[PDB]
């Protein structure tokens, strides 16, 4: 018996389950990135031999192997489930999900029932990877596996862009919903479905464990009227209209099938739960044949299309123009087959061409024939394939891009010039022009440090890594829907836009840059008013975006609905406000000591949402100093709660009430971790690492969407 | 409803409670730090105003604090329980934990039950830990103030030494023990006894949140006998035998008192279960008054001493000479008080001196007198109290100094100059002599790349910073115990000796910095049989330790029984060899990269234990290349289980055995994020990043005890 915590099981986690997880702000880190510190993917994936590559992937697609070998000699229909299982993970509330890290290749997504076999594909990619080695990453082989699929196969793709970097552990900071085991139908304990099948808010799928819908119906239940509607649902929350989900559902669908020829009780564990002799992959059969004819995948059973290795209007061929029944496939799996189909229309056998097997539809296919929102559109599709094919690139394109950011950081030859609206595009922004010309200009304005310091923050606030929208380029701040989101205090807002717009005029640079030099003058003030002089590092090159490159309702998802840290609240919330606040800064990429500063300093600044005195524990303000930190942690106040998410500090000695404190404030002198942080910046001889921290996190914050440069 | 996993119960953890923790191999990393990544506390604590702290320390002593106050004006016993439990949660068998890290400020062990109100004291250390900063660790202050403590009551201290660094986490690699609540009797489901009342092994207290023993007797019940078993048995894995254990039983009780006046079930959550008006405090009492005579910390209640303010002989006077019987503390707990005590004897109350309140014994106490063992050595302290004193303060400094490692890392003016053989004494190695010379000869001799590899690999593999013990400097493996042990290949290991040992002796090197050499030049050859040249750094110095400083039985705990890399199990335990291989490169310092090249590396090199071929996938061994990854992710074969520990890798085509493999082996291909490193390695392009990464690592492995440098 050892003394090492070697299993995950052995934790503090157990102990206290309901504590931060302040590990997902230290993901990612130098010990865990096996590459050398100044490895940079960007530069070397641009000297990547494309068209090299190009050529492999397509002849991969025709290279059976023989321990998981290909359906009819080809494997473009697990290469398209790979790439659009990679990418269906995405959600629009968070930007979490999607294909651009790579993921598919770590825990929980590597084990996922919906991802059953996948574990085959991404193996079978394995020798390109080995081949082109640095310069193409897993996730970017993953996201680009479909697309030279689809192309082997006849249809013309829309491109493709390079440029996501691997990652080398799960990403922890993702919550895939409640429930504790997989799969388990809504009627159950930790169920992620409220009120009226209303689907709790983060999440893009029906169940734990599953992409979007349960292709048998809902709960397993086949009716394809109730699956449409979590289509519609799941779908919208992937970003995707009626039209992009029945083009891609049809266009996934006219290729490849359904495996179910077996006993799916037989599968040995996924691949996190399997043993070492399975070389890191999952669900083998070791009791029979698991492999060609004889695969189980989703215990569906048949192909939706008669040439299921090639584009073709088949899919709708065959849904519309067969009637449908329930039958039970092989494995037990409810699915839907045609009525009396001709011999010639029935997909032949995976292995032997001369055999002839069966059609089938899911309860999702069927749901494009029974809603009758979807019905117009599949007839559209039926009637104008040359539209369902346009359609259907172009969403496959928005699919497996919908996290790449902006434009700025797409690589390669295959990238469209087209600027689609979805990519938040945000032109270059004028950089020759004088600095402090228009610092000068701010200052002489009569704006105050916390006019100039929230707006800089509100507009630099909305970015979040996970999909890469938000921040400060483009400006965006003054037009709709932001300019009037309540957290963003439109009147300072319009108050402080309307100087700063002619400052901009006045100037030629663009309104996008003067607001983040302007909270930089803000920031430098309110230093030199504590006798400290520096100047704020400043990158010019912002463009200001247009309301016609800004889908107004896009941009829903990215309001500011709470923000720690101008403690801000838009309404009393289920999660507590500091769990709030550690996702809105594990969005902004912030690490738990930049947090620790910000918020401090932001206190003291003056900067809280109304002009509140929350936590603002200073005789100062408008000064920079550490003073949040010093009487934070000073135990002649004694802190008693006083209603909603508020508290009293109060002195000891008199009994008076010195300040009030949200839960955002008070968390950092209450969590054991903060409090260390909170204590180090509390130190007499921290003063100035204090400043130097704060502005390093605020320009980290400032420049986090600036792909353009870098 | 936000997206992020912002509290600890949501993880990939749940789902596959048995996978790897490698978490536990990328702590305490550059996201986590708040400090400068130049910042080094060695530099600072030597300019550490040392009179000074000592004097301000001292004064916090009789300074109370209102919302904590002072027993009888003076903190010293509440101070000396603090450092005593920041170190008594050492253990010897892995020398994890104790007071090196400051880990009494985080969780768990902040939140232990018999850490109770110490949370009050590690608060009161506060404004002196403000007023030195970063001169001044949190670990050092705790270590610390137990000493100064002793100091104002009037012992003689032996010494102390500054030099621990803070952390800013848990640590996550320190496994507590199997159970899932507080403090249950060892009949319990998840008990970490076994046999007849036998102490798993890593373990060194009797149960989950204790330091050592249940002072109310075992599981509760008191019994002086089986409680002094128990109390023998934790110290002995805390490194105290009967002399060392019973002084600081004696020495500690000598001085303050057990808090037990109250009812227990009104004091609110312990720290990480309290909310954030706690101020990061626990235990608080809201109900009725929870401090002076009020306070409830153990729940017994009482002093030890007529005066427990100062160093005197009061305890043997009391234990011995009063007869002593079973009482219940106003708490309710299980306590000895005296049967017809004198007034004059009683302690006063804690407020008020002129009231008289009640002395007490701990089921431990009574241990001292009613073991046969102990009762002789508390009459030699009865007897002879200047021995007493001496034997106390040096067990004192040896507890709170335990895990410090050599002596190079001491630092300050009260460090003693005595060699303490528990600091594994060794001297300075010359470090004037030819380096190349060393090598020729080296290479001139006959002995293999395997041999000079594995016994330098042996030679430093010992080393672990939990306690920092081990390591290459000294050339202990030429000793016993370790020149016998099995792991080490003795016949093999003396063959080497021989050699090197004349080398040393031509050279003025020491036996310890030739052993490294000759590593090193093994790898040097190896890399050139593949056509690389290098050279590896190389650090002089190395002194040779002697036999009369090296505690044969101490050394005990550092026998690798287990070492996956060189495929090396002495029996087959219960813990995975994964685990295993994943507990020794923790212990080493080791990152998940950086065991993944090791182990690929060794493995060509042909250093297994026994000369086995068990993960030798090379036709080449004795070059270094990177073949064991490239043929560990080659899906041409399969992997067949073949026994314990063992595999056969099949040709797929041929169905004929190529090689053979253990656990160890496989798991850098069947994790998944062993598998993305080996993948990495794998590649076209990464032969020589493969080769560059080997020796780092192998040269962090050779330098990792090397403090006398730095
Ligand atoms: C775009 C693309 C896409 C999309 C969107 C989709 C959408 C979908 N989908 Fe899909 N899928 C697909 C594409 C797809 N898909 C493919 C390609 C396949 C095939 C695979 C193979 O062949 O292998 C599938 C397959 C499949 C399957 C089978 C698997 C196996 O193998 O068994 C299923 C169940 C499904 C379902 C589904 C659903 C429910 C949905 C909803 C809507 N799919
Ligand atoms: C060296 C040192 C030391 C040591 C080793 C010890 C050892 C011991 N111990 Fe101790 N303790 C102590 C020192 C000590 N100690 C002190 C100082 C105190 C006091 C605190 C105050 O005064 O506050 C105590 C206290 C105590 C108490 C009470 C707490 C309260 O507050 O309530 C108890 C129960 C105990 C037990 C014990 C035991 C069972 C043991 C075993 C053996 N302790
Ligand atoms: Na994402
Ligand atoms: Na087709
Ligand atoms: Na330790
Ligand atoms: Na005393």
Redesign the pocket.
Known sequence: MHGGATTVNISTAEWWPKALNLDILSQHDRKTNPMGPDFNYQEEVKKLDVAALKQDLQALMTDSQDWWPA?WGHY???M??LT?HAA?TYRIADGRGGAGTGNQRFAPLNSWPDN??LDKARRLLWPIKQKYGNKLSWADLIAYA?TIAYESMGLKTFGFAFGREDIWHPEKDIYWGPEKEWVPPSTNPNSRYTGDRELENPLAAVTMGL?????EGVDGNPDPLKTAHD?RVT?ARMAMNDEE?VA??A???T??????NGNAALLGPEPEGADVEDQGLGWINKTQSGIGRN???????G?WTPH?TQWDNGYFRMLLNYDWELKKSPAGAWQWEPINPREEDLPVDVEDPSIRRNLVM????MAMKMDPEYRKISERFYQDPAYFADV?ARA?FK?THRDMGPKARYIGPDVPQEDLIWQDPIPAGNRNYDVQAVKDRIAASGLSISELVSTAWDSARTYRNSDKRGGANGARIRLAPQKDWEGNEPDRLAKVLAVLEGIAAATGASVADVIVLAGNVGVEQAARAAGVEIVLPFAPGRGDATAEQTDTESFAVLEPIHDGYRNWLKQDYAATPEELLLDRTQLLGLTAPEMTVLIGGLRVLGTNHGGTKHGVFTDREGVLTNDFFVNLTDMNYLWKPAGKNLYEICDRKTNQVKWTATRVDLVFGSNSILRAYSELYAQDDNKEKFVRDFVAAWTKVMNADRFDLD
Chains 1, 2 share one sequence.
């Open positions: 359906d473009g229909g697990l398209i489930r659009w269906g059953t076999n479909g992409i979007y819908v349960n292709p289509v779908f989900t891609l559902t266009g996934g669908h290729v490849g099938k359904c495996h179910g695969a189980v995948t989703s215990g569906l059973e192909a299921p899911t309860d999702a296919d259907f496959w699919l």
